Ligand binder design. Structure first.
Ligand SMILES: NCCC[C@H](N)CC(=O)NCCC[C@H](N)CC(=O)NCCC[C@H](N)CC(=O)N[C@@H]1[C@H](O)[C@@H](OC(N)=O)[C@@H](CO)O[C@H]1NC1=N[C@@H]2C(=O)NC[C@@H](O)[C@H]2N1
Ligand SMILES: NCCC[C@H](N)CC(=O)NCCC[C@H](N)CC(=O)NCCC[C@H](N)CC(=O)N[C@@H]1[C@H](O)[C@@H](OC(N)=O)[C@@H](CO)O[C@H]1NC1=N[C@@H]2C(=O)NC[C@@H](O)[C@H]2N1
Ligand SMILES: NCCC[C@H](N)CC(=O)NCCC[C@H](N)CC(=O)NCCC[C@H](N)CC(=O)N[C@@H]1[C@H](O)[C@@H](OC(N)=O)[C@@H](CO)O[C@H]1NC1=N[C@@H]2C(=O)NC[C@@H](O)[C@H]2N1
Lengths: 211, 117, 119, 122, 54
RNA sequence: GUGAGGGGAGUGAAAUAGAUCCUGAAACCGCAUGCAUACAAGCAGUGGGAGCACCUUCGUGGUGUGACUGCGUACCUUUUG
RNA sequence: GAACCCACUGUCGUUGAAAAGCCAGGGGAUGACUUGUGGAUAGGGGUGAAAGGCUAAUCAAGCCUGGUGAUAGCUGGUUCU
RNA sequence: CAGGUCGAGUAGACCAAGGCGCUUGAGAGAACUCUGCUGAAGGAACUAGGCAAAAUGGUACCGUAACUUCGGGAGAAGGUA
RNA sequence: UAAGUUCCGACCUGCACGAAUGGCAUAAUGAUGGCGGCGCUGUCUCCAGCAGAGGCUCAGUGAAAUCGAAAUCGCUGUGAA
RNA sequence: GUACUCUGGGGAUAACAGGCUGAUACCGCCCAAGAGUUCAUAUCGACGGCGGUGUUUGGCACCUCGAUGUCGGCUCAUCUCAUCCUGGGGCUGAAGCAGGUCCCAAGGGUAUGGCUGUUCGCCAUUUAAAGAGGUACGCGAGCUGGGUUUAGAACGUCGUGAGACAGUUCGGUCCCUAUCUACCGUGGGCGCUGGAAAUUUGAGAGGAUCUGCUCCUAGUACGAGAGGACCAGAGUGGACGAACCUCUGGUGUACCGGUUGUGACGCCAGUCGCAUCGCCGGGUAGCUAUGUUCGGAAGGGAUAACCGCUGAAAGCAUCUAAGCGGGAAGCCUACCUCAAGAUAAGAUUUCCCUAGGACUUUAUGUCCUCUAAAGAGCCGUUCGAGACUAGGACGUUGAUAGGUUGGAUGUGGAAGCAUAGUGAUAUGUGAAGCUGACCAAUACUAAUUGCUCGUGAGGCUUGACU
């Protein structure tokens, strides 16, 4: 479905009149500018390509400069596609703008982001492995993996065995978030709960796929 | 004001504007809204302020009292609508920002001297 | 993880690091041009420049703060009579750090630290 | 935040004075009990000539904790002790008096007697 | 733990196939005309016009 | 670097006889040239076999390499094996 | 309870800093105490508040040299066509 | 042999006279290992076993049970400044 | 003890106690064996953060055991099984 | 006699694990006296018979004695189905609620403690359930070392004795820096029909898959009564997983303060070094769980047992032989992530390069001169990215980092001076002073002048359009 590309600004709270404190995440939205429309005839599928933000001309390459100039829009800091159907595709044309008014208060959405990077990590943190005894004669084996397999049969380590390695810094989608506020003056979405990534990261907001 | 300006604006939109001045060591009464069914009433919570957090809309303060012989603490959120009103009954004179040492004192040992004008 | 943390370690205890940077600041204020390793040179800014900012205003309390931070009477006197008046109208950036190759003994990268208007 | 081997005071006049939690009821591998949860306890100390005796295994409901409870506005309420109220075999209070304050999470048809008998509900 | 078989010279060289050195970034200093390391003071104490040692 | 070491010059029949110096093998380690090699599974050869490079009596020839292909689980000892 | 003399517990160390240790705790500490220098006891012997302990990093019979090229119905090896 | 301030002290902290900075360094600040500090609620549920760790700790005065070989137990326990 | 193959007291069909290879007790003593309690806690539920030393990168020096030769994959079967 | 021991040999020969076998063990089936008020077969089932598996006890002695070095616990698993729970069914001696028995089904899930070295077992209290097994009775170059099985000592018992045990008891050293395969992460090279900057399709791969209670239908159907539903809807939990730091807390040895001993800054005052950050009380960012939010929702397709519709072979009957349906937490989809080294190397948008001679090996030919694009990298300032890398931002046409200015926060009343006190101290100046990492501005300092790589229109054949 068609969605929005924005930037995570930080977490805060909204107080209701009954006194309930709702934890919220604020997403800045610079209105998305359509750069290309992909169709069945020329591309074999239907999508809307958008750009957002700004980029200096010394960082915009000549190929991208021509690509943006064909659509007639200012260069953005990123380019991203949304898969669409004909119903959502109608009304959208190259050079148009998609704003925060695409959403409504109370709507349920999915938010995608790039999670924080934890670097090289061990079994305890990465896979919730249990530590061994801190005392009672233990020898330098407090946070180690333990056994990694069986004996001569099968005589190898299976694929997908949980071990130490890089954790985080990956694409994560969180489903079931409720739109708390749609501020058109500031071009801001306010959603309930936490979303992946650090402050300042790029996020994608789409209508929920679950129903 | 360690947040981004947009977050600051969104938070400043909801600030209370009639908050009194109070400090750790003061004894205060808080009127708390209680709603059961369609029935609304105000319940009083009176005691000593042992901690104050100044964080704009994220401000909080902790009140300690002895209720039926059992010590109880509540950490109120300052700008929450459930806090209907705050009144300062008596001003205390202390030497530090956080009065957690009061938890280990009972009776006369836990008395706070009045701040004299 | 060290997300958004400031400061260095340099293989030293905290007290040793603080003493070393105090010594470096004293030597810099005395000679106005020194040679050291590049990480030490870059971290020295955060210690040396605030001292000049403090010395811009001559008061007894400011002099005592400078003496508590430097423990050198000659350094305090030079800061409050020479360096502060010299940099009164400069909005920071009293030092410049310039890469200067590597050191023979251990191939450590080196740099010069210089006061902006030295001579 | 009550687990096994945790000692609790008794906020009633059933006769028990100290109890020890021996099980957290209501689920496999369930770790902790909070205000309004049912636990199995053993009676470690009781006053003489009472309905309850030292060494009995009974049910109880947690009414006060030091870890505390959260409220919808973001506040937390903490108590100075961990206290329980003794129940019978069909999970109903057996006491006639309640000592100390209780919280509003006990406002159910099962525990309304505690609310009615308590000196303070907060 | 130790090898069960001696490693061949071919495999040893294959492991060393990533051991080559690289050049530094050198540049002619327009103020003085000598080759110097880029972004570094020259050996005689010159950098982008300013001269350090009188 | 008034170092070590080397390049000339000179001596000598000979200096790749130059000082731990007659001859100067092998293991082991470099540089140069030719061919092969980054979609394909194993005692590394063997029987076939295209292409390429140099040479050439110009070939039904010589030297080097070896795409692709059939077959193929070291040696010794001790053992019923 | 320090020095000094010991070696009960644990982590570390185990191609160690060390062929028996370090660190944190531990026991005795005017006595059947600890210790320097110089002597005596020598191998089926010595010495032993006794563990087969100790007798030069070696002990159910020290070390060195001889008999001696001990013997081995056992294991290994045994070289061109 | 062995000073100063506190101290019963040759214990201990910091200093004197007098000596040193221990013959690879510079960065980085991942998993994991060693050594430390702190830790919500619970408080032996750990484990072969409270192993390890945590805890107690001074001076003066008050007070101190069973048992006893009449010495002890005993600095019992506990309290105040 | 909620739950006690261990512990304490008692019973006696003592497989196979018993009186200087001493019997039954016994105050004090023991880095001696077993059981229980208070306090205490990262022993544990269940781990988190931080400090130092390695680990990692750069410059210098520079080991080890092992090793028939290697162009050194999975599965099912076979076969000194 | 040797457990105080030693040498030469053997996998010619035992103990462990493997192998062959399957008496034994476990599971299944056939016949059916009888039990079941009548009624072999709802449920059991005598006397006898036939098989399956390879968890037991064994038999053999083929591999290993120039070493395959472990009872239990811990950590981490993977598979089977003869299924413990949840799902779907047939029969019933199935009124309902329950239960018994058999069939299908391996997606997920499947206790904490007391005793003991235990595996096991008994017990206490939970749960929807606390399944049975294979994996060298999985896992000790991953941990432990309580039991067993060295050397010390003792008891019971045996022996004249040295000593010994269908026994017991106290004590008693656990080595290895990982070459290859495998696995978890992360790069370099080349390839992909001229080169480049982006955006992408999805052949496929992995992850996830659990479940309680309450209310309602309805005290209805059912039943004499006691009791009490199917189907279909709401609410609220447990366990598990992910992301996050607004809230609640922990930590926070470059933030603030109190205080002891000692030394020093000439002295007072004020400070600093050392004593675990000396000790003590707070605490900003970051990280983090015990904190917060979210997830396993819903729907399609083919099926399992089972139930059919119509229908002959076989004038009837029959789910089947033609033909047409229903049907499960299971399979394919669906949800999330990865994915063209998918060598079958895919698609789309945009950008760049349009020069001369000689010669023969007459061709994407070999040498001279000219040319050096779009871009990429080196270097520098760095990061909520990170072992090194890689990845993201910026390099004067600049807010990339430091500093500076302002704010915010934390701590909690600086120094100096002046008052009141004999004094310790107290008060005023003034919520002052100081404030790592935060927010916002600001070219003061550092990102200089640069260099390297990457070329010059992209072979041939055929077809269709021009
Ligand atoms: N184009 C290139 C040009 C480059 C440029 N030019 C630079 C250049 O050129 N640099 C030159 C560097 C060369 C080198 N560094 C110099 C060097 O080495 N000096 C060596 C100086 C001292 C030397 N060690 C002494 C020596 O030799 N003692 C030996 C020794 O005691 C022993 O010998 C052995 N074996 O045991 C003995 C037995 O005989 O003999 C002695 N000797 C005897 N000699 C005698 C003989 O002959 N007969 C009779 C009897 O008297 C013999 N005994
Ligand atoms: N002709 C040629 C002769 C050649 C000669 N043979 C070569 C030779 O022998 N090399 C030996 C290398 C040893 C050492 N690494 C040398 C060095 O480099 N020391 C660095 C110091 C140099 C500095 N610039 C001067 C300095 O601070 N002095 C102080 C001062 O005098 C004094 O302090 C106060 N407060 O009064 C004293 C306290 O007692 O301590 C001294 N400091 C000291 N540091 C030394 C240390 O640790 N150990 C040895 C001794 O030197 C110690 N004293
Ligand atoms: N056999 C089927 C058995 C179904 C089960 N008995 C009902 C139930 O609680 N299911 C889910 C389930 O626990 C889990 O979800 C899934 N799907 O596994 C969780 C997170 O998604 O949500 C629950 N649902 C919830 N609804 C509630 C809500 O809104 N507030 C309060 C709290 O009760 C929330 N949890």
């Amino acid at each position: 479905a068609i969605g929005l590309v924005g930037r995570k600004c930080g977490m805060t709270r909204i107080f209701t009149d009954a006194g309930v404190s709702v934890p919220v995440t604020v997403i800045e939205v610079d209105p998305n500018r359509i750069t290309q429309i992909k169709t069945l005839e020329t591309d074999g599928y239907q999508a809307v390509q958008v750009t957002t933000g700004e980029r200096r001309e010394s960082r915009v390459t000549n190929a991208q400069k021509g690509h943006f100039a064909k659509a007639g829009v200012a260069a953005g800091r990123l380019v991203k596609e949304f898969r669409v159907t004909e119903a959502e595709l109608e009304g959208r044309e190259v050079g148009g703008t998609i704003g925060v008014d695409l959403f409504t208060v109370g709507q349920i959405v999915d938010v995608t982001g790039q999670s924080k990077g934890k670097g090289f990590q061990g079994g305890v943190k990465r896979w919730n492995f249990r530590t061994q005894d801190a005392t009672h004669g233990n020898s330098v084996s407090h946070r180690v993996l333990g056994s990694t397999g069986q004996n001569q049969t099968p005589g190898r380590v299976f694929k997908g065995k949980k071990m130490a390695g890089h954790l985080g810094d990956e694409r994560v989608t969180v489903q079931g978030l409720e739109i708390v506020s749609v501020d058109t003056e500031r071009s801001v979405l306010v959603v309930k709960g936490a979303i992946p990534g650090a402050t300042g990261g790029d996020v994608i907001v789409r209508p929920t796929i679950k129903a | 004001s360690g947040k981004h300006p947009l977050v600051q604006a969104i938070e400043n939109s909801q600030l209370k504007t009639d908050l009194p001045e109070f400090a750790p060591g003061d004894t205060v009464v808080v009127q708390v809204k209680v709603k059961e069914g369609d029935r609304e009433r105000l319940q009083a919570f009176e005691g000593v302020v042992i901690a104050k957090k100044n964080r704009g809309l994220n401000s909080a303060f902790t009140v300690r009292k002895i209720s039926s012989g059992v010590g109880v603490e509540r950490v109120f959120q300052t700008h929450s609508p459930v806090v209907a009103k705050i009144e300062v009954k008596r001003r205390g004179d202390v030497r530090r920002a956080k009065l957690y040492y009061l938890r280990d004192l009972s009776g006369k040992a836990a008395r706070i001297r009045e701040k004299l004008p | 993880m060290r997300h958004r943390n400031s400061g260095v370690k340099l293989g030293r205890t905290s007290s040793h690091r603080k003493a070393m940077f105090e010594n470096l600041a004293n030597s810099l204020f005395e000679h106005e041009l020194i040679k050291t390793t590049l990480p030490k040179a870059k971290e020295l800014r955060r210690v040396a420049e605030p001292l000049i900012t403090l010395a811009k205003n001559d008061t007894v309390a400011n002099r005592r703060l400078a003496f508590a931070r430097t423990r050198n009477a000659a350094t305090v006197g030079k800061l409050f009579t020479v360096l502060g008046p010299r940099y009164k109208e400069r909005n920071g950036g009293y030092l410049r750090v310039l890469k200067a190759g590597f050191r023979a003994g251990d191939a450590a990268p080196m740099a010069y630290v210089e006061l902006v208007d030295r001579e | 935040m009550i687990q096994t081997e945790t000692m609790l005071d008794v906020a009633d006049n059933s006769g028990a004075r100290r109890v020890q939690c021996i099980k957290v009821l209501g689920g496999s591998h369930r770790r902790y009990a909070s205000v309004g949860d049912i636990i199995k306890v053993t009676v470690k100390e009781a006053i003489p000539r009472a309905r309850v005796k030292k060494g009995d295994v009974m049910n109880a409901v947690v009414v006060r904790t030091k870890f505390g409870i959260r409220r919808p506005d973001g506040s937390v309420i903490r108590f100075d002790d961990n206290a329980a109220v003794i129940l019978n075999n069909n999970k109903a209070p057996i006491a006639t008096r309640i000592f100390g304050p209780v919280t509003r999470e006990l406002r159910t048809e099962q525990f309304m007697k505690i609310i009615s008998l308590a000196p303070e509900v907060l | 733990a130790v090898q069960q078989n001696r490693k061949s010279r071919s495999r040893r060289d294959m492991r060393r196939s990533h051991d080559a050195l690289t050049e530094n970034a050198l540049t002619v200093d327009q103020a003085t005309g000598e080759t110097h390391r880029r972004h570094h003071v020259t050996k005689d104490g010159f950098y982008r016009g300013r001269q350090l040692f009188a």
